[PDB]
């Protein structure tokens, strides 16, 4: 049972690290999306004029 | 405590609580710095849209 618990603990810690990496990926992608959105808004204003 | 030295459940619980508070600390500081309630859409996306 101690072996099983050790395996579970190590796996869960590594999984937490993987989830942190996923959060980083999402943040980078969303920043790029925000810049694209600003560009699109400016293009729309230019079209309006 | 007095029984065991290999682990410190008190330390682990304290670390978890510290991290939980730190999340809100970071959120509040970035919110104040930006001056916008909705930043990076980590929250209600209807407001962002």
Q: After which residues is chain A broken (C to N over 2.5 A)?
A: none
> The tokens of B19 are what?
């991290």
CA dihedral (B44, B18, B2, B4) positive or negative: positive
Contacts for B30 with CB less than 8 Å, ≥ 6 apart: B39
Q: Does B40 touch chain A (CB under 8 A)?
A: yes
Cβ distance B41 to A31 less than 8 Å, yes or no, reads no
Q: How was this structure determined?
A: cryo-EM
Query: How many Å separate Cα A3 from the centre of its chain?
Result: 33
For A:1-49, CB contacts with B below 8 A are 27, 30-31, 34
Q: How many CB pairs under 8 A join A and B?
A: 5
Chain B residues touching residue A30 (CB < 8 angstroms): 40-41
Give burial (CB, 10 Å; 0-12/13-18/19+) of B11: exposed
Residues B40/A27, Cβ–Cβ less than 8 Å: yes
């Amino acid at each position: 049972i101690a072996n099983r618990f050790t395996s579970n603990i190590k796996g869960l810690t590594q999984a937490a690290r993987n989830a942190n990496d996923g959060i980083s990926v999402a943040q980078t992608t969303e920043g790029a999306l925000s810049e694209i959105n600003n560009n699109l808004q400016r293009i729309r204003e230019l079209t309006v004029q | 405590m007095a029984q065991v030295i290999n682990t410190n459940s008190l330390s682990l619980i304290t670390q978890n609580n510290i991290n939980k508070n730190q999340s809100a600390l970071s959120s509040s500081i970035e919110r104040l710095s930006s001056g916008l309630r909705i930043n990076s859409a980590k929250d209600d996306a209807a407001g962002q849209a």
